Each structure stands twice: as C-alpha cells, then as structure tokens.
Design a protein around this ligand. Structure first.
Ligand SMILES: [Hg+2]
Length: 148
C-alpha cells in the first residue's frame, strides 16, 4: 500500500518514494505546528507560508475525502495519491482546482473537487487518460497536495 509520512519526512512504513518534480508539493518541507481545518472558501494563499493567517499556521494544502481541507496538519499524510483507494469514473463538474499531485504509480495528476463533493484525479501529462475518484480512506489520512 502507499506509505504514510510523518511531519519530519520519515516514512512510517514501506519504502520512501520521491514526489514528482512538476507537483505542487515540494519536499523536503516542514509542517505540523497545528492541525488547521479550513473550508473550501477559506483555502490558503501565497504569502501565508511564513506569517500564517487569521485561521492559524500554514504549511500548504492537504485534503482527504469528506471533503476535509487542512492548511496545516501534524499527523501522518500521503505525499502521493494512494491509487489503490481510487476507482475510475466519468469526469465531474469541477468546483475547485486544488493542485497537481503525484500518484502511487509515479505519474502527475490534476486534482479537483467535484460538485457532489468528491476528490477526483486526472492524469496531467503524457498519453494518459485516467479519471479516478478517491472512494476509500482505509487509514483516514490526507494527501499533502501543495507545499507553501
Ligand atoms: Hg490542475
């Protein structure tokens, strides 16, 4: 299964993989001063990295199904989409584009928030056409989507 990573970057099981170079997540990068849930209307900004914002500290953007968005998170997260928890689906109407994330297959995916509230991924590049929704979350932990 796709591993989880702790707030220092150390993988918690399995073997460590690097993130895709054109992902919005850039490692190494600190996080986890506080767990800060935010709404889809209150997604973090650029410039928030150092100061934070009214809502609190900011290490970037995390997400799990729900949808539940965080602007900082302390516990275990994914650095790549656990595609074992994903299933093919037709393209939805997108409410929000949130970033480019690496897949457990090693490839780059665009990640969207659908109208129904599902997290969907579409392969960013190459002759790839995959449209997948995050259906399970076994370990109830978010993907680090973007780093500030
Ligand atoms: Hg995108």
């Amino acid at each position: 299964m796709e591993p989880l990573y702790d707030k220092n970057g150390a993988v918690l099981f399995g073997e460590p993989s690097d993130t895709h170079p054109q992902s919005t997540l850039k490692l190494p990068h600190p996080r986890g001063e506080k767990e800060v849930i935010v709404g889809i209307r209150d997604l973090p900004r650029k410039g928030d990295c150092r100061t934070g914002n009214r809502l609190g500290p900011v290490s970037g953007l995390f997400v799990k199904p729900g949808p539940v968005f965080y602007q900082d998170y302390s516990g275990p997260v994914y650095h790549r989409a656990p595609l074992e928890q994903f299933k093919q689906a037709p393209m939805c109407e997108v409410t929000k584009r949130i970033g480019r994330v690496t897949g457990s297959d090693g490839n780059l995916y665009h990640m969207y928030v659908c109208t129904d509230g599902c997290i969907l991924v579409k392969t960013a590049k190459r002759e790839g056409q995959d449209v997948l929704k995050w259906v399970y979350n076994v370990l109830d932990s978010p993907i680090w989507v973007t780093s500030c």
